Amino acid sequence: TRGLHDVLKFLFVYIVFLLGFGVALASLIDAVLELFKLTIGLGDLNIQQNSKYPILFLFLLITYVILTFVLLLNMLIALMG
Amino acid sequence: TRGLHDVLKFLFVYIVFLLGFGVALASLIDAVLELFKLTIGLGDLNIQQNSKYPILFLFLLITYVILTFVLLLNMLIALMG
3-class SS at B50?
Answer: coil
Tell how far CA B41 is from the center of its chain: 13
- What are the residues whose beta carbons fall under 8 Å from the beta carbon of B40, sequence distance 6 or more? A40, A43
CB within 8 Å: B41 and A44: yes
**Phi and psi (nearest 5°) for A45?**
55, 45
Q: Cβ separation of B4 and A66 shorter than 8 Å?
A: no
Q: How far is CA A36 from the centre of its chain?
A: 4
**Cα B81 to the center of its chain, rounded Å:** 21
Cβ-Cβ contacts under 8 Å, A40 against chain B: 40
**Is B37–A46 a contact, with Cβ atoms under 8 angstroms apart?**
no
Residue-wise burial string across A44-62, b where 16 or more C-beta atoms lie within 10 A, e elsewhere: eeebeeeeeeeeebeebbe
Instruction: Report the residue from A46, A72, A73 with minimal CB separation from B34.
Output: A46
Question: Is A81 touching B (CB cutoff 8 A)?
Answer: no
Distance, CA of B46 to CA of B25 (rounded, Å): 13
User: Per residue, what are the HEC states of chain A?
Assistant: CCCCHHHHHHHHHHHHHHHHHHHHHHCCCCCCHHHHCCCCCCCCCCCCCCCCCCCCHHHHHHHHHHHHHHHHHHHHHHHCC
Buried b (16+ CB within 10 A) or exposed e, B34-63: ebbeeeeeeeeeebeeeeeeeeebeebeee
What is the least distance, in Å, from the CA of B28 to any CA of chain A? 21
A22 carries a ligand binding annotation: no
Resolution (angstroms) stands at 4.4
Q: What span, in angstroms and rounded, lies between the C-alpha atoms of A25 and A46?
A: 13
